[PDB]
Amino acid sequence: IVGGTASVRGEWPWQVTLHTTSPTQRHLCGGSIIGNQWILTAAHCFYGVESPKILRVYSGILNQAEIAEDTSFFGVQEIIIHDQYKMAESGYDIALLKLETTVNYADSQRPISLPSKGDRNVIYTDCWVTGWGYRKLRDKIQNTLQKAKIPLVTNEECQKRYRGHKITHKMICAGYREGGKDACKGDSGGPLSCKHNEVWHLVGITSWGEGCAQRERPGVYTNVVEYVDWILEKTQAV
Amino acid sequence: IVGGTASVRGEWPWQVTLHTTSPTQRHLCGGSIIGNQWILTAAHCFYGVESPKILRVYSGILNQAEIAEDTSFFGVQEIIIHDQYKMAESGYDIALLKLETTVNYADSQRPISLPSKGDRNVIYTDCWVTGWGYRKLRDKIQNTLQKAKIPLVTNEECQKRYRGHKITHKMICAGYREGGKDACKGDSGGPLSCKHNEVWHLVGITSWGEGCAQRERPGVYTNVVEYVDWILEKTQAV
Numbered sequence: 001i002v003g004g005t006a007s008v009r010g011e012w013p014w015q016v017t018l019h020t021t022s023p024t025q026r027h028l029c030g031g032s033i034i035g036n037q038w039i040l041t042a043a044h045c046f047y048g049v050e051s052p053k054i055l056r057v058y059s060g061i062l063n064q065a066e067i068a069e070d071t072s073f074f075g076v077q078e079i080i081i082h083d084q085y086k087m088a089e090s091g092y093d094i095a096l097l098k099l100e101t102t103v104n105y106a107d108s109q110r111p112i113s114l115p116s117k118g119d120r121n122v123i124y125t126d127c128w129v130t131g132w133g134y135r136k137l138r139d140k141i142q143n144t145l146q147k148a149k150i151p152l153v154t155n156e157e158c159q160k161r162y163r164g165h166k167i168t169h170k171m172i173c174a175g176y177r178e179g180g181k182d183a184c185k186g187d188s189g190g191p192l193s194c195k196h197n198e199v200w201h202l203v204g205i206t207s208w209g210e211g212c213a214q215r216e217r218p219g220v221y222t223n224v225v226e227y228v229d230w231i232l233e234k235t236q237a238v
Numbered sequence: 239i240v241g242g243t244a245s246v247r248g249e250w251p252w253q254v255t256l257h258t259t260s261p262t263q264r265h266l267c268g269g270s271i272i273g274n275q276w277i278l279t280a281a282h283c284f285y286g287v288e289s290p291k292i293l294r295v296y297s298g299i300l301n302q303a304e305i306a307e308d309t310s311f312f313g314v315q316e317i318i319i320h321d322q323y324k325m326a327e328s329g330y331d332i333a334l335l336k337l338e339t340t341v342n343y344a345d346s347q348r349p350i351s352l353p354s355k356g357d358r359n360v361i362y363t364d365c366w367v368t369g370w371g372y373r374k375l376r377d378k379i380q381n382t383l384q385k386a387k388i389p390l391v392t393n394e395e396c397q398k399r400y401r402g403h404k405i406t407h408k409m410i411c412a413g414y415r416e417g418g419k420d421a422c423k424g425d426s427g428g429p430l431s432c433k434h435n436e437v438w439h440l441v442g443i444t445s446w447g448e449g450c451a452q453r454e455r456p457g458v459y460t461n462v463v464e465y466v467d468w469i470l471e472k473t474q475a476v
């Protein structure tokens with residue numbers, strides 16, 4: 001996260017850090033708890049990931065220093081990528097992780113509500129992007145979970161800023177005209193969380209941008225409400 | 239290493255990478271093979287290291303990507319720190335690691351010769367500092383082992399550049415007046431290797447500097463020849 005601040009412990013209790021153990025263990029991407037066995041994240045996080053066995057999901061984390069060889073984690077039983085996903089910049093940047101065991105909800109770990117189709121008209125004015133990613137384009141993973149409040153921009157505005165792309169209604173953009181606050185490398189798959197009528201909603205999934213926090217380059221997020229049917233379909237038993 | 243280049247595989251076969259496994263595994267410092275059970279490194283590398291059990295020594299490495307959970311390593315049986323060591327900037331920045339098993343020498347892993355007391359008069363003109371450390375003061379560990387050729391400076395010259403320190407005859411300095419090539423964070427404990435009469439000698443141990451590669455700030459190294467008695471004393475059986 002560029003231009004953000006350190007989070008209060010457990011103020012984003014749906015935020016997980018997804019590690020890979022290959023070759024040695026490291027943070028890979030963010031994610032969000034959406035059900036007892038389900039993390040919502042970005043499809044592009046799994047480039048070159050050939051098996052779920054090398055994945056570990058860590059809930060209830062503020063600082064990456066909390067994560068040691070003795071720290072409990074959730075194994076991944078299945079990676080589900082959207083069948084239309086090819087790459088972040090063409091959309092469908094969405095995946096589910098089915099965990100090997102169920103999360104026991106507590107104050108430090110609980111699920112975020114999915115956006116309602118009836119809230120598409122809702123102007124979300126209180127949105128935050130969170131993660132352990134870079135503070136600048138060339139940097140490293142941050143110890144403490146960072147947050148930044150970022151205004152949504154309209155899809156029309158966002159299209160003017162990415163003239164070589166197709167910004168579709170399955171994407172949602174957020175940023176300041178002058179830049180300075182944004183997601184960056186390592187934040188992908190994490191939430192864009194918007195508080196509306198005292199409830200937190202998972203409005204977007206951190207997906208891509210041109211650089212990080214640049215003037216006139218809004219962050220591009222997966223527009224989660226366009227995928228609630230897909231999520232329902234994919235999270236049913238057998 | 240600042241201002242260096244990628245090494246040829248195994249051109250520094252005495253160079254090891256010392257990892258810590260706590261909290262998760264990462265490169266800690268460089269080191270040099272000086273005997274079948276012995277790595278020479280910097281005392282200051284062990285700040286906060288309470289047990290040798292969390293140390294792993296990896297020989298025969300060019301790229302950090304080679305190191306995975308299935309990669310063979312040497313355990314550390316004992317950390318021996320100079321009894322006069324307090325901190326890098328006051329000298330005695332030297333330690334031995336006694337390995338749990340013996341290294342089998344090969345083309346990719348073999349010991350570097352210690353400098354001779356008779357070579358103190360020798361003007362070493364072919365010296366190289368090597369490691370996986372930062373390319374700039376705020377950066378991260380590099381994948382490929384870097385090298386940089388660096389001229390030794392006299393202890394008199396070095397003292398003029400560090401007026402708030404005591405540069406003693408137990409230190410040796412190396413750098414360009416204009417800066418630009420130097421060791422940096424993560425290179426400590428590694429060799430300053432000087433080739434003389436077709437033989438490589440371990441002249442220094444990467445220890446400290448003010449920043450990395452700055453104008454008029456030579457790298458400061460442990461002057462290994464001042465410690466050959468100590469090394470002999472500490473590497474004897476029982």
Ligand SMILES: O=c1ccc2cc(Cl)ccc2[nH]1
Nearest residue numbers: 183184185208209211219220
């Ligand atoms: O480099 C990056 C990687 C991800 C990324 C994600 C958003 Cl949402 C914005 C900028 C970004 N920049």
Ligand SMILES: O=c1ccc2cc(Cl)ccc2[nH]1
Nearest residue numbers: 421422423446447449457458
């Ligand atoms: O930050 C650092 C750390 C180690 C270090 C070592 C030498 Cl030899 C020179 C500069 C240095 N700068």
